[PDB]
Design an enzyme around this catalytic site. Sequence first.
Site, short mmCIF file in Angstrom:
data_model
loop_
_atom_site.label_atom_id
_atom_site.label_comp_id
_atom_site.label_asym_id
_atom_site.label_seq_id
_atom_site.Cartn_x
_atom_site.Cartn_y
_atom_site.Cartn_z
N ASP A 1 -6.91 73.04 50.31
CA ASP A 1 -6.27 73.29 49.02
C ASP A 1 -5.06 74.18 49.30
OD1 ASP A 1 -6.62 73.18 45.89
OD2 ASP A 1 -6.30 75.29 46.36
N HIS B 1 -8.94 56.26 23.08
CA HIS B 1 -8.04 55.90 24.17
C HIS B 1 -7.61 54.45 24.02
CE1 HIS B 1 -10.38 59.36 25.45
NE2 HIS B 1 -9.38 59.67 26.26
N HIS C 1 -18.41 95.76 20.77
CA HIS C 1 -18.00 94.43 20.30
C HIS C 1 -19.08 93.36 20.50
CE1 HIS C 1 -14.14 96.56 20.81
NE2 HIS C 1 -13.67 95.74 19.89
#
Length: 1030
Positions: free
Chosen positions: A8, A538, A963
């Site tokens: 890669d 598609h 949170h």
Amino acid sequence: KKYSIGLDIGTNSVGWAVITDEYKVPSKKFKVLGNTDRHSIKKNLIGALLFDSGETAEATRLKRTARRRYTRRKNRICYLQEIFSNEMAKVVAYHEKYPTIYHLRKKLVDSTDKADLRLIYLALAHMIKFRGHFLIEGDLNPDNSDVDKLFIQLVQTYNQLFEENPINASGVDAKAILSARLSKSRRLENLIAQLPGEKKNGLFGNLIALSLGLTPNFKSNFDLAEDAKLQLSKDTYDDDLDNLLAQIGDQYADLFLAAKNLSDAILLSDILRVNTEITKAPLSASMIKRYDEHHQDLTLLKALVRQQLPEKYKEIFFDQSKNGYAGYIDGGASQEEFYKFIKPILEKMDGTEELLVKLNREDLLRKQRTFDNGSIPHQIHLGELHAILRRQEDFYPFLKDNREKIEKILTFRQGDSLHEHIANLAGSPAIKKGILQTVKVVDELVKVMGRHKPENIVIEMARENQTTQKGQKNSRERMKRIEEGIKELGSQILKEHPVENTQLQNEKLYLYYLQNGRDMYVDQELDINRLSDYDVDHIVPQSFLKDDSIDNKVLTRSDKNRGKSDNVPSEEVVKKMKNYWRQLLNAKLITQRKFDNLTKAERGGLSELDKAGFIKRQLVETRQITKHVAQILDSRMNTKYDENDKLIREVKVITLKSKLVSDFRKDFQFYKVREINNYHHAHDAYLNAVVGTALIKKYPKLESEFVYGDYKVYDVRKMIAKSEQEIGKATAKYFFYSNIMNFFKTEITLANGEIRKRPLIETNGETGEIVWDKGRDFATVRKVLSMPQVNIVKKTEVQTGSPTVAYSVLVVAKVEKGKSKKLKSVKELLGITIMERSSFEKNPIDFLEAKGYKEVKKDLIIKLPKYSLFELENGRKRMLASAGELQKGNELALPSKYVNFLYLASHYEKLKGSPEDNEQKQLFVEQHKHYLDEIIEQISEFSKRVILADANLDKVLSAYNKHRDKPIREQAENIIHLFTLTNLGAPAAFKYFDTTIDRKRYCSTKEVLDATLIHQSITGLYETRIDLSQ
DNA sequence: AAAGATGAGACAATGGCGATTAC
RNA sequence: AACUUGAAAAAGUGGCACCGAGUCGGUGCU
DNA sequence: GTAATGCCATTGTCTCATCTTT
């Protein structure tokens, strides 16, 4: 035993992985050198090299420099001279008869008389020293030489590199426009006039200007801060292009290459235009005609000036400081400056006809040695050289004896250095460095495997994920598309329902606005506030081609309206909706290809040519840089031959597209989250190896598409079965459905809903070898992605070029302490500046005593470049950033299930899959929401032993508790931001929601002086560990 | 009226220097 | 990267399977 | 007395404002 390598390649990292036949990553024991008690370590053959994109000795070694070129040319001349030696030992009119070498060359091509060998050598040496480029491979033919085909190839590369907002050029007559005898700018304007969608300042317009010989500025096309001007004729173009590409990335490299190719075509058409003989030396004849025109225009100008304007003659031919003719000949004045200086003089005088039509064509009083000759391809010089050799073949036997030698001298580009091969490439210094690193990685990997070369080397050029600065550019482009399409059609949908570019990132909303707010298959209006019930269909099913772009997607209330066929939508709907599709076509809302696919049932439906187009679209790599990297790796890996002159290819170099591995990850939930650690480069390499080996085992006859080399051109239309199952999978015919990745899938959902079934074990038809086991292989892939030990290595680099520190140095010596100056033993890091480096290396002891150190232990001095790696207690690692600061040295190996959970939670609204699949992912996230707390726990335990930033860890845990009420998507996204606390490398500030966590720096280097220093190979598999307690 | 070019101002990331604090 | 040999370009130096998997461990072979 | 824990400097990007060009 047999293995394959996956690569890669990127601009800041190189991922690498080793796979076996059953798609497993080997784990091996490696020796550990040094003076510690650790003599062996177990490592997985998977990893990724990380490196800076900076000023380095290696970097300067990979830059094009005049000296390397010079020695190259000199060597060629030396060879030529050795060939001429034995005969040369036996062997005013010239200068007056031939004032330039092109006259002599044209004589040697057009004269049957015997010529002096010295002049022959002069001709050959001129053709060899400046031999021209090697961008076009093989003999000259219209496919790679005519202006038309190369213009079509240029606009094909352009449309391919974007595929949205593209320019379509079919009606244009590129030859008549580009080859016409007119000025460069007028040719540019004439071609732009034939393209209503593009303008001269656009990217394509600037490319045409570059191919014609102008000097375009690419700042507006890429918003660059510094002006980047390119001129193909300028000698410093290559490095300028390399500078340009470094700013905008190497994806646009082939674009500029195609521009260069177009220029060569125009030049080839400009010389072949004039044929005073049927076949000749076009270049030399053109230079002679240029000489003749120069002589005529010169004598006429001097006659007219002397007759009519006696004054200011000295300013033109004697002054030379203000770019006159004397400045053009004797001074540093270019052709354009000379033309700009003499244009008003020619405009003022009378009897100046004919000189101005040549001046406007930039062919007035030209020299024979000018800046344009860089554009001349080498096939021309090869042709003329062959011609000269053929003319003097019978007269001199040693030309018959040494034909192939001279031809090889002209054509050769033996084995030279790797650095020169990489320096000749067209790319940024970053990708060139990465390519060199990749080559070295391959060398070390084949060394590690007992000098056994792999069966396959799969290469991917890693794509640069969105940096979010471009996330607004795409929204702007699609917004301009919607606004121009709406203004062109005339339906004021934007007036009643205004939208902004932020909301247009959603696929279904963008398609809603792209289709004029109407159903694609049915003659009814869409419900603006019920798009969740509507499906995206598609035009060409996923079973035939994996195309998830807007070019192949439509929005409709139900995909059952396409009809019962597994092909394109039926004729009963096409016949009814062709008018509406033509209205959407002529308004530039959709591309020509999308209309062609939408109206494919009128031309039979999908055909073998369409399937062949799909196979070629999926399997071939368009990038030239990738082909050159594959060429380098193939040439270094494959070097055996046979009795004939045929290359034995033991190792196949497979070139893969990033889309294949990306879709493989998305289809089978092997998700990538780059923010967790740097393991994803290595993982991408592994998945590339897997996909490559599967494809070469499944379709050997399609080797010519991916494998680099000269193979039998196996046609793809004939290998398609007539029927689905009767002829497909029961005969030599490899596949009826044109999607290559179908054999990985267990089920194949067509566009109607019928679920096609594929065998549990996929095997090759001709040899009966199992290529894919849908149980064991997916489990193996998941196991590989789940491995926690992946070799991440930061390339240590001396800095070259406050002062900059070249490298730091561990000094063990003594220093005076106190008034009495008692000698006290010390061990400390001293930064050696770039200016000080040569002096320190010349005599280290003298430099150190000048710094104040005494009784230095010369043999214990250790050179420590940036990123030198140290390991302390509990596996905690640090990298050297400086003489007084450290970086984080560890990677957080998060288990795969949490990675996939994070990808899914962050990808909540954006899934791009079937509704059932989407429901499964959503229920998986909700059923596994406790993974949020578990990932936080993992961050805490990793940070407790590895990071030691307890103020920031307390801040993080506090914010996470603050949170826990927030939605899952947001908590996932902010945990993604939390992984910068634990990432390898330099500490950086980050945010959890609105709470900012400032970087905790390692501002002391003391502890590393008693830690274990780890010197690492490029792959990190080989290491040496030194216990600095001493 | 819209697009392109140039200069200056807030961001971003990493390393270095000086001062305050702690051992 | 480290180490060895060289003024330098540059040459050389690091065993294989299996069971596992928290940054790699253990066992057998050699 | 020595070493460890906020602001400034350097290299790149991006955005906004004003002026000029098509």
